[PDB]
Paper text:
Reasoning that reduced thermal stability and poor crystal packing may explain the lack of structural information for hTREX1, we screened each hTREX1 chimera for the ability for form protein crystals. We identified conditions for the growth of hTREX1 Chi 2, Chi 3.1, Chi 4.1, and Chi 5.1 crystals and determined three crystal structures (hTREX1 Chi 3.1, Chi 4.1, and Chi 5.1).
Human TREX1 is a 3′-to-5′ exonuclease composed of an N-terminal DNase catalytic domain (amino acids 1–242) and an unstructured C-terminus (amino acids 243–314) implicated in membrane targeting.
Numbering used by the authors:
A (entry chain A), B (entry chain A): 5 to 46, 55 to 165, 175 to 236
């Protein structure tokens, strides 16, 4: 029930990309929202905690976005270039590690459908740089799996869960930060039971196999 | 009129601290919102640009916050400690530099009353670490001075300007991110004239003398 102790910081996480996994997609946006478990040790949509750390970045993917990805995210490779965005590089990896290092350990990334998309994509971008070590101290959980267990104790898409719990659609379904903020709200529904589940299911990020690139 | 060329990225910036300058205050929160000038090359409150980078962090100050600072910010040293916040350290300096390095140069920090508070406080925190080099490539402007010139072409507090331009109070006047987002909105009022002023008045950050600490 505590394979790795209590997770100290939950890092709510979302990335947007150029396409689906089969397409060897590249990140176009990412957001990390770090919340100490203290803020979760304790209807209508709750306010976020006062004390949080937030990082939201756009990324030049180096290839075209699919039309569908651009409709969903409002991003395109040309638009990212017009704003001088840089590719996923060593500096970005160092930035992610430095942000994680502001937080008390153990770190647990939390992402909706993260096992199938966000986590293997992040692993793949790091693997292409030879920098999977940037994330090797972290743990991770997929909140689809979590919310299924909490509601059991229907669709489990993020918007489905949000409207089921709060009776309104999430705002800002087109940025990575908006997805992370909606995920936070759903995780605040039954926060103590969520923390028990996270503690029991936290998985070392080093066991996430990359979507593509060296394993 | 172009002493340093066109500024490429405007980094809207705010820090909260334990007290007033006389008290040798310490940072408790900071937010940087990086916007490429493209997003400003072109009533009611406008939406922020789609493509932005955002960094918001809380910081353990190492000393008590004044009661007034805690009323204003909702932060206290004990609350920051309950959430495991770390002091302003080398890792934070590296994080700030890595975030700046995602942006095209020249970088121009933009902060309201920044010449008197935010800029010398940031310089002082870096000076105490021996890391003023983290910010030495940057430029900076104080948006009080900017908005005075734009309106000339009354109080110039952030809230005064906001309600004067948009007929409503800014939301979230208690977090660093809320101040940065309200500052962004005011800078979007006359964006081209703001950019001309910024280009003409941008000041090397190395000329900001620290609020305290080694000069």
């Amino acid at each position: 029930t505590l394979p790795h102790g209590h997770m100290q910081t939950l890092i709510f996480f979302d990335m947007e990309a150029t396409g689906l996994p089969f397409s060897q997609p590249k990140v176009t946006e990412l957001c990390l929202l770090a919340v100490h478990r203290c803020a979760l040790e304790s209807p209508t949509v709750p306010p976020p905690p006062r004390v949080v750390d937030k990082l939201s970045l756009c990324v030049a993917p180096g290839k075209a976005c699919s039309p569908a990805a651009s409709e969903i995210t409002g991003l395109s490779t040309a638009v990212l270039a017009a704003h001088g965005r840089q590719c996923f590089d060593d500096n970005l990896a160092n930035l992610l590690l430095a942000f994680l290092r502001r937080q008390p350990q153990p770190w647990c990334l939390v992402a909706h459908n993260g096992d199938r998309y966000d986590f293997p994509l992040l692993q793949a971008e790091l693997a292409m740089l030879g920098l999977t070590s940037a994330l090797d101290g972290a743990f991770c959980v997929d909140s689809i799996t979590a919310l299924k267990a909490l509601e059991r104790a229907k669709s489990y898409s993020l918007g489905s869960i949000y409207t089921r719990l709060y009776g309104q659609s999430p705002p800002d379904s087109h940025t990575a930060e908006g997805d992370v903020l909606a995920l936070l709200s759903i995780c605040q529904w039954r926060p103590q039971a969520l923390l028990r589940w996270v503690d029991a299911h936290a998985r070392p990020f080093g066991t996430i196999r990359p979507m593509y690139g060296v394993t």
